[PDB]
Scaffold this motif. Structure first.
Motif, mmCIF file in Angstrom:
data_model
loop_
_atom_site.group_PDB
_atom_site.id
_atom_site.type_symbol
_atom_site.label_atom_id
_atom_site.label_comp_id
_atom_site.label_asym_id
_atom_site.label_seq_id
_atom_site.Cartn_x
_atom_site.Cartn_y
_atom_site.Cartn_z
ATOM 1 N N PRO B 152 17.452 45.825 40.870
ATOM 2 C CA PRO B 152 18.534 46.387 42.346
ATOM 3 C C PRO B 152 19.755 46.875 42.121
ATOM 4 O O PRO B 152 20.488 45.786 41.156
ATOM 5 C CB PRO B 152 18.379 45.334 43.281
ATOM 6 C CG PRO B 152 16.251 44.165 42.660
ATOM 7 C CD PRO B 152 16.949 44.288 41.151
ATOM 8 N N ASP B 156 28.287 50.933 48.544
ATOM 9 C CA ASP B 156 28.811 52.381 49.582
ATOM 10 C C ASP B 156 29.156 53.175 49.320
ATOM 11 O O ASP B 156 28.905 54.192 50.601
ATOM 12 C CB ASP B 156 29.862 50.990 50.432
ATOM 13 C CG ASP B 156 29.231 50.074 51.095
ATOM 14 O OD1 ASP B 156 28.530 49.727 51.396
ATOM 15 O OD2 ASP B 156 30.515 49.429 51.089
ATOM 16 N N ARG B 175 14.400 49.257 34.917
ATOM 17 C CA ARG B 175 14.141 50.459 35.930
ATOM 18 C C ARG B 175 15.115 50.128 37.563
ATOM 19 O O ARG B 175 15.620 48.918 38.267
ATOM 20 C CB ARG B 175 12.659 50.467 36.238
ATOM 21 C CG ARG B 175 12.385 51.428 37.854
ATOM 22 C CD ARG B 175 11.736 51.574 37.900
ATOM 23 N NE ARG B 175 10.998 50.573 39.162
ATOM 24 C CZ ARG B 175 9.641 50.266 39.613
ATOM 25 N NH1 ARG B 175 8.712 51.717 39.467
ATOM 26 N NH2 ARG B 175 9.481 49.860 39.662
ATOM 27 N N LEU B 177 16.844 50.114 41.755
ATOM 28 C CA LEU B 177 16.425 50.507 41.993
ATOM 29 C C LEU B 177 17.237 50.948 43.404
ATOM 30 O O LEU B 177 17.320 49.748 43.578
ATOM 31 C CB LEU B 177 14.955 50.123 43.183
ATOM 32 C CG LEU B 177 13.919 49.590 42.268
ATOM 33 C CD1 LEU B 177 12.865 48.862 41.935
ATOM 34 C CD2 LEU B 177 12.990 51.056 41.982
ATOM 35 N N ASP B 178 17.026 51.061 44.142
ATOM 36 C CA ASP B 178 18.214 51.635 45.493
ATOM 37 C C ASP B 178 17.895 50.117 46.398
ATOM 38 O O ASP B 178 17.050 50.659 46.789
ATOM 39 C CB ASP B 178 18.566 53.558 45.899
ATOM 40 C CG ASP B 178 20.215 53.132 46.506
ATOM 41 O OD1 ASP B 178 20.802 52.334 46.855
ATOM 42 O OD2 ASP B 178 20.119 53.984 46.868
ATOM 43 N N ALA B 179 18.728 49.884 46.231
ATOM 44 C CA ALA B 179 18.890 48.609 47.859
ATOM 45 C C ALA B 179 19.360 48.480 48.889
ATOM 46 O O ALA B 179 19.883 47.674 49.323
ATOM 47 C CB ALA B 179 19.158 47.365 47.279
ATOM 48 N N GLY B 180 20.159 49.375 48.792
ATOM 49 C CA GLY B 180 20.954 50.465 50.049
ATOM 50 C C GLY B 180 23.034 49.881 50.178
ATOM 51 O O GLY B 180 23.896 49.602 48.735
ATOM 52 N N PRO B 181 23.325 49.505 50.927
ATOM 53 C CA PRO B 181 24.642 49.635 50.945
ATOM 54 C C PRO B 181 25.299 48.228 50.608
ATOM 55 O O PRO B 181 24.138 47.301 50.162
ATOM 56 C CB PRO B 181 25.063 49.422 52.618
ATOM 57 C CG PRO B 181 23.861 49.931 53.542
ATOM 58 C CD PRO B 181 22.765 49.904 51.833
ATOM 59 N N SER B 183 26.130 46.302 51.828
ATOM 60 C CA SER B 183 25.742 44.690 53.154
ATOM 61 C C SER B 183 24.524 43.737 52.658
ATOM 62 O O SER B 183 23.846 42.704 52.693
ATOM 63 C CB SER B 183 25.969 44.994 54.257
ATOM 64 O OG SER B 183 25.740 46.554 54.274
ATOM 65 N N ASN B 184 23.940 44.689 51.805
ATOM 66 C CA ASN B 184 22.476 44.278 50.883
ATOM 67 C C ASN B 184 22.901 43.360 49.872
ATOM 68 O O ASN B 184 21.692 42.566 49.302
ATOM 69 C CB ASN B 184 21.515 45.675 51.086
ATOM 70 C CG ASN B 184 20.655 45.288 52.285
ATOM 71 O OD1 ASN B 184 21.063 45.208 53.490
ATOM 72 N ND2 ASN B 184 20.796 47.137 52.192
ATOM 73 N N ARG B 186 23.949 40.505 49.478
ATOM 74 C CA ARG B 186 23.492 39.149 49.752
ATOM 75 C C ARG B 186 22.001 39.089 48.784
ATOM 76 O O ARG B 186 21.747 37.755 48.128
ATOM 77 C CB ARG B 186 23.921 38.688 51.430
ATOM 78 C CG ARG B 186 23.142 36.970 50.742
ATOM 79 C CD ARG B 186 23.701 36.472 51.929
ATOM 80 N NE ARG B 186 22.885 34.999 52.138
ATOM 81 C CZ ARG B 186 23.251 34.321 53.072
ATOM 82 N NH1 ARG B 186 24.969 34.179 53.546
ATOM 83 N NH2 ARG B 186 22.947 32.901 52.667
ATOM 84 N N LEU B 187 21.448 40.039 49.778
ATOM 85 C CA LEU B 187 19.579 39.672 49.338
ATOM 86 C C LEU B 187 19.592 39.875 47.312
ATOM 87 O O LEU B 187 18.771 39.403 46.974
ATOM 88 C CB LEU B 187 19.169 41.018 49.865
ATOM 89 C CG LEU B 187 18.958 41.031 51.524
ATOM 90 C CD1 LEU B 187 18.369 42.067 52.498
ATOM 91 C CD2 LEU B 187 18.260 39.836 52.573
ATOM 92 N N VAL B 188 20.025 40.401 47.397
ATOM 93 C CA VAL B 188 19.929 40.941 45.561
ATOM 94 C C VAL B 188 20.349 39.202 44.843
ATOM 95 O O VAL B 188 20.199 39.336 43.835
ATOM 96 C CB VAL B 188 20.951 42.487 45.445
ATOM 97 C CG1 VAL B 188 20.143 41.885 43.594
ATOM 98 C CG2 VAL B 188 20.197 43.262 46.077
ATOM 99 N N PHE B 211 9.309 44.922 40.433
ATOM 100 C CA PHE B 211 8.278 45.024 42.218
ATOM 101 C C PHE B 211 7.013 45.826 41.560
ATOM 102 O O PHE B 211 7.209 47.213 40.998
ATOM 103 C CB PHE B 211 9.325 46.162 43.006
ATOM 104 C CG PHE B 211 10.964 45.114 43.095
ATOM 105 C CD1 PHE B 211 11.321 44.994 42.407
ATOM 106 C CD2 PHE B 211 10.454 44.043 43.861
ATOM 107 C CE1 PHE B 211 12.733 44.318 42.654
ATOM 108 C CE2 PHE B 211 11.640 42.626 44.678
ATOM 109 C CZ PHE B 211 12.972 43.532 43.638
#
Ligand SMILES: [Mg+2]
Ligand code: NA
Ligand code: NA
Lengths: 212, 212
Positions: B152, B156, B175, B177-181, B183-184, B186-188, B211
């Motif tokens: 992941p 920004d 591989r 995978l884009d997990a966003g800004p 600010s995500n 912490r989830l990664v 995944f």
């Protein structure tokens, strides 16, 4: 064993009811309205064939079960748990619940405490087991779909956790993994908003996870 | 392109240097002392063969790179980033850092804010990309290792994130995978303590994630 799927009228409940009943477990679909639960139980039996899937009001489903799974949306979970406290306190309760919010920057974990620990507190229970949060519901409810997913499981009581892990292991395609005490539930629950973010930003469908 | 592995004398740095160098990228192994970085790079070059792996002081490696990967432990990562701020704020900086605490009940995420976001703040930079947190180091450093892992990636700045994702995609077995800004992040980053718990409570070796 007897498994109550409280609020089991969605895809996760459907998938668990179909797969576990086919393995010989007695499934009770619970809903706020008995008529709704009986209707969904009838629907599942048609798909599953000759298996034990019955519908009852949530309170009666909880009363009759060995294990109760909280398949209700997080938004109404605490109120449901609280109403069933006296009945559920002595049963094994499985929480696949996740506090997640949608936002303009993606999905976030929206609680400072985990859903499983909040449920354990509301129930005043030592038998809450956190599991099944990352099972892609639509794919799981499709009996023609094959999968290979891992299911992290958290919980403070060794025996309750062992029972739940054994039950999950019976479903071909699911591998339960012990993730420790319930205090690690936030790490397991967080997998959901992570996955929703991966789905969003890469234009992917529902996904499960594998540790290897 | 040019990639600086700051503090790249460990296994994560080893794995990255070998694989990216063999793909044709110019790798600079960074360390506190120029002479020690030079020796580590030499050791890697003997494994990789005819590849560009050079050693330099961290400051010089960062200055010569296009991308700088913070392959240093979390403990003194912020002090290191701060020391290199004037050099790093203009480069793409990849953070595989994770704040983890180890206790009696398992591993926990030990920060309120993510490591990547703290790094971006110290560097006053918009080009921080969070990636590579869940790559089992020792396994990744072995070129005969078979693995299929997803990575992941948060950030920004779209251009910077795309550059890093393209780089990771080149490595067989990974591989992105884009997990966003950011600010995500912490989830990664949270995947690391989750995996450390899974390893501890199931008696498993180091693992990556996929995944599916
Ligand atoms: Mg190829
Ligand atoms: Na299984
Ligand atoms: Na690849």
């Amino acid at each position: 064993m007897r498994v109550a799927l409280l609020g089991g009228t969605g895809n996760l409940g459907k998938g668990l009811a179909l797969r576990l009943a086919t393995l010989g477990h007695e499934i009770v679909v619970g809903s706020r309205r008995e008529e709704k639960a009986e209707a969904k139980a009838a629907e599942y039996r048609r798909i599953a064939g000759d298996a034990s899937i019955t519908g009852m009001k949530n309170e009666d489903a909880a009363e009759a079960c060995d294990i109760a799974v909280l398949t209700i949306p997080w938004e109404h979970a605490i109120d449901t748990a609280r109403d069933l406290k006296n009945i559920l306190r002595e049963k094994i309760v499985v929480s696949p619940l996740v506090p997640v919010s949608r936002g303009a920057k993606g999905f976030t974990y929206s609680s400072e405490r985990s859903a499983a620990e909040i449920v354990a507190e509301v129930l005043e229970s030592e038998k809450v087991v956190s599991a099944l949060h990352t099972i892609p519901a639509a794919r799981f409810a499709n009996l023609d779909e094959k999968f290979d997913w891992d299911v992290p499981v958290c919980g403070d009581d060794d025996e309750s956790k062992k029972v739940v892990m054994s039950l999950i292991s019976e479903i071909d395609g699911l591998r339960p993994l012990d993730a420790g005490p319930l205090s690690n539930s936030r790490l397991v629950e967080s997998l959901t908003p992570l996955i929703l973010n991966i789905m969003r930003f890469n234009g992917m469908g529902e996904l499960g996870i594998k540790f290897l």
